[PDB]
Design a protein around this ligand. Sequence first.
Ligand SMILES: NC[C@H]1O[C@@H](CC(=O)NCc2ccccn2)[C@H](O)[C@@H]1O
Length: 330
Amino acid sequence: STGSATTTPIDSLDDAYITPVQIGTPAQTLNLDFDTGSSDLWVFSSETTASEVDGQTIYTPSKSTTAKLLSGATWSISYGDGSSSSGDVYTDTVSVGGLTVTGQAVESAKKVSSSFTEDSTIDGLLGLAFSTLNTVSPTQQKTFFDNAKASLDSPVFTADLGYHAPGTYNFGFIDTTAYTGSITYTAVSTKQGFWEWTSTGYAVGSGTFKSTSIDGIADTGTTLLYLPATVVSAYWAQVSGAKSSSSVGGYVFPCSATLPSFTFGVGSARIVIPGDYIDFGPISTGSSSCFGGIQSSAGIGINIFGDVALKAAFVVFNGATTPTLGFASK
Ligand SMILES: NC[C@H]1O[C@@H](CC(=O)NCc2ccccn2)[C@H](O)[C@@H]1O
């Protein structure tokens, strides 16, 4: 089997991407944030505290003939940005782009934090990291990908995120028309439950490539590119007027600037992030100070190749017995 679904930016800045997902019988379609940095599939639901729902589409398990309460199971997750959610668990039929999994754990939110409430466009998350990170207790549950894997033509999914444009998540096959040149594959460590890999270095604009190992995770659920302070300082030094602002919470730059590209290494291959991918617009409405798309990982504990990096590439998440990651230009 295979699946193919279009993923769409939630706003004009590509702050996140949503992908339609069919849950239950008859189908209830929710727009979920596919997140390769976490491993829970959770949704706004008929069980979510009323005051914490503001415009989201909810899952109502009582209206699904295939929904079954997973007795005694609860879940609770907190993300790197401090957001969080929790609730109980159903199993139900879940389909993504024509690919169907029966008995998928669908985690129903009873509580969500304010940032989820305030985002009317995201109805929940679909985790695509390794199932070892799944928070369901007392019996850990598998991700959609892990459940589907055996049935897929090939045990892979691919992320093809657009810049200010729709893109595609494919499951079970590699669309050879969706990228240019070749796909370069690189080793993955699953020791922390992430798609963790080591970049071979970087360049700023037309500058010389710096060969240096940068360990980090491929995370579709993170907006920006978070890299070591040395690397990030070298980037923003090439932008006149750019500075790190503690009040704003990162590097900002004059909105009149032209941003240089940023290149990262994948083995001997190179992925080039165009400068305008790194522009996340005015820090507040009407401001002439703009927020940068490359930020320091110093306060995070990990480097994160988020959407800013990934949308410059066609990315293969290879879930073979020994997982690997593939990157191609496009
Ligand atoms: N500290 C490492 C962990 O932090 C995550 C980064 C994060 O929170 N991104 C934003 C975000 C918000 C809401 C939902 C999903 N992502 C990584 O995926 C790891 O899991």
